[PDB]
Design a protein around this ligand. Structure first.
Ligand SMILES: [Co+3]
Lengths: 219, 201
């Protein structure tokens, strides 16, 4: 999705301001919002790919004006409605429609074990690897309206496969209920000149991006 | 000149209320357990943070066999120190050398190695850093008071997939036979993202 979230190479965002000695949570409300994520993922209310894509689909201005955890807040209020876990009324009113009908999957007893384990996107088998480290590849020019992990600034660009990480879930399909379609993910190296052109580049700098097998073609 | 889109702009005046309303709704429907959520907050507020990565760096500095294992299998390597899990399932450690300076970013959102660095600071997740890091690394680094020699390659790693990256910074000169413990004090969060160097003694 060619949205505001795909920021790589954009101009005009200004200096990188950094708050000295920044706390993990700047406001109490952020603690609530952050802790809701693992809780709702554990229920299987949605997966992380639909979550990313929900943030991608918020209005561009809302995205820019909202602090990070407002993005998450937006997902919970909207993605849960789209998934039919909540109704628009429940979310507007703040009041459940029929009391405690669900049971929390994330309970105190499993919090530690679940955070310590996580959920890898690696898979045993999937499409064979078409590329080997050292291969020159060109990122396909694709502009899906849905979730994708090929950044806009890499499309049509030629780089070099420098790592084959093995097989992983494909978010482009997983975000849209089209299955996992596991395939290889490579780290591809692009030169500064290749991405940005002669003028806007430095001769030494390179950019490495992780791309799925079918995002690529032989250069 | 207010903060507008750099991660530190003020939230809406009523955000705490909205959050509280959603939380009550989810508890009432039985979708979330408040006690479990408290344990999640505690984990990232007090138990998971850059000190974890610092131990990993320090150990790689003093132990060549560990360093090799770490560079071969990041996830297993950091697990030797008890670090593992959410947003760190598939780790790749990036070794800085005199020829190469590594740094990472998630241009598409905020992806970051939680088990070793904890949750990302707001600037890492915001447009200025994300947009510029892949086009003008040197310019961004200069704003952090870091000037990379012109002859040193900068490698920017964009976290677009499920791999998570951590930088293994170079050991500062003049730190011979330091204990892992004293070495770890030198390792800043910045040095492990690549936006800084470890402290010089
Ligand atoms: Co991200």
């Amino acid at each position: 999705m060619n949205g505001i979230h795909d920021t790589g190479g954009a101009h005009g965002y200004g200096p990188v301001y950094r708050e000295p000695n920044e706390p993990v949570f700047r406001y109490d409300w952020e603690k609530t919002v952050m802790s809701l994520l693992p809780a709702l993922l554990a229920n299987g209310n949605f997966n992380l790919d639909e979550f990313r894509h929900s943030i991608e689909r918020m209005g561009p201005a809302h995205y820019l004006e909202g602090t990070y955890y407002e993005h998450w807040l937006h997902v919970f209020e909207n993605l849960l409605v789209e998934k039919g876990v909540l109704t628009a009324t429940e979310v507007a009113t703040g009041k459940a429609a029929s009391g405690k009908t669900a049971t929390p999957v994330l309970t105190p007893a499993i919090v530690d074990g679940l955070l310590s384990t996580g959920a890898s996107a690696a898979r045993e088998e999937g499409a064979r690897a078409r590329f080997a480290v050292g291969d020159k590849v060109r990122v396909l020019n694709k502009n899906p309206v849905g979730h994708t992990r090929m950044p806009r600034y890499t499309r049509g660009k030629v780089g070099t496969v420098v790592i084959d990480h093995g097989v992983f879930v494909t978010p482009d399909t997983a975000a849209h209920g089209k299955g996992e379609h596991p395939q290889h993910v490579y780290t591809v190296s692009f030169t500064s000149v290749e991405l940005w052109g002669q003028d806007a580049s430095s001769p030494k700098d390179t950019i490495r991006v992780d791309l799925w097998d079918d995002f690529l073609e032989p250069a | 000149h207010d903060h507008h889109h750099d991660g530190y702009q003020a939230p809406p005046e009523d955000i705490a209320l909205r959050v509280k309303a959603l939380e009550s709704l989810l508890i009432e429907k039985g979708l979330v357990d408040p006690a479990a959520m408290d344990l999640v907050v505690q984990t990232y507020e007090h138990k998971v943070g850059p000190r974890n990565g610092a131990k990993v760096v320090a150990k790689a500095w003093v132990d060549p066999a560990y360093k090799a294992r770490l560079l071969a299998d990041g996830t297993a390597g950091i697990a030797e120190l008890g670090f593992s899990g959410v947003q760190g399932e598939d780790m790749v450690i990036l070794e800085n050398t005199p020829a190469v300076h590594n740094v990472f970013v998630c241009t598409l959102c905020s992806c970051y190695p939680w088990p070793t660095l904890g949750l990302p600071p707001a600037w890492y997740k915001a447009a200025p850093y994300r947009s510029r890091m892949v086009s003008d690394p040197r310019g961004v680094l200069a704003e952090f008071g870091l000037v990379i020699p012109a002859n040193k390659e900068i490698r920017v790693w964009d976290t677009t997939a499920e791999l998570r990256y951590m930088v293994l910074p170079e050991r500062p000169a003049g730190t011979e036979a330091y204990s892992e413990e004293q070495l770890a004090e030198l390792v800043t969060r910045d040095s492990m993202i690549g936006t800084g160097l470890p402290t010089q003694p």
